[PDB]
Write a protein that binds this ligand. Structure first.
Ligand code: NA
Length: 242
């Protein structure tokens, strides 16, 4: 039986959430894709889902996958971005979902995209627990003093509404899937500029794990048979603002 870590999310639970009143039962987009993929393997993969997080805020996704390296988890199933400090310690599947960072802002301010954000010195929101914090600090050399962690779409909206002068932010940098859910309930805001990274989401296993290989073939079959799109439509259909 594999001990599979699953992020205990407090927000954007469409992706993955613990079933209320349970410790080990989960649902969501990421769970349905993992189940559908495992069901295409020619061998059984018995799993027990183990929540990772304190239940009060979204967990550190990098710390979650580090639990594979110490042997606490046999793998991690969730909305986990396939980024370099993680691929060097664990093996991911190929992406089952596309992702990448975008800039969210009000229209009609100096923030037109990531370059105008880096040229300026305004506070920038990011999602609690996300790789985006390290990406902004290390890849783009944004001062840690500008970076404001936000835990929920209500927190995103309050920070954007308040803006830099009232303890909020000029813009939020986060992965497109979260941002599309956010904007569908918060149309006063928009993506400005282009998606400027492109790491997808994968399932994570120990280095050299054949599961990371075999499940990428299963992903091909879900993509071809229309099940990846059907599971997307089940959980993530949203009301466009435009
Ligand atoms: Na990959």
């Amino acid at each position: 039986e594999l001990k599979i870590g699953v992020p205990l999310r407090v927000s954007y639970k469409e992706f993955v959430s613990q079933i209320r009143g349970t410790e080990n039962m989960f649902k969501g987009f990421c769970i349905d894709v993992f189940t559908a993929a495992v069901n295409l393997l020619p061998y059984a993969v018995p799993v027990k889902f183990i929540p990772y997080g304190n239940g009060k805020e979204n967990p550190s996704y990098t710390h979650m996958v580090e639990m594979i390296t110490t042997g606490n988890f046999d793998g991690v199933v969730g909305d986990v971005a396939i980024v370099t400090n993680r691929t060097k310690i664990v093996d991911f599947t190929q992406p089952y979902a596309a992702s990448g960072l975008v800039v969210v802002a009000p229209g009609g301010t100096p923030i037109k995209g990531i370059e105008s954000l880096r040229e300026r010195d305004d506070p920038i929101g990011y999602q609690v627990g996300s790789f985006a914090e390290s990406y902004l600090r290390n890849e783009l050399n944004i001062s840690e003093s500008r970076l404001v962690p936000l835990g929920t779409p209500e927190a995103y909206a309050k920070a954007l509404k308040d803006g830099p002068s009232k303890g909020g932010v000029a813009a939020i940098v986060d992965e497109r899937p979260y941002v599309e859910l956010f904007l569908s309930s918060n149309c006063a805001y928009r993506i400005v500029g282009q998606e400027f990274t492109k790491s997808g989401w994968g399932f994570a296993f120990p280095r050299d794990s054949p599961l990371a290989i075999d499940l990428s073939t299963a992903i091909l079959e879900l993509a071809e048979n229309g099940d990846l799109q059907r599971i997307h439509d089940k959980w993530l259909m949203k009301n466009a603002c435009t």
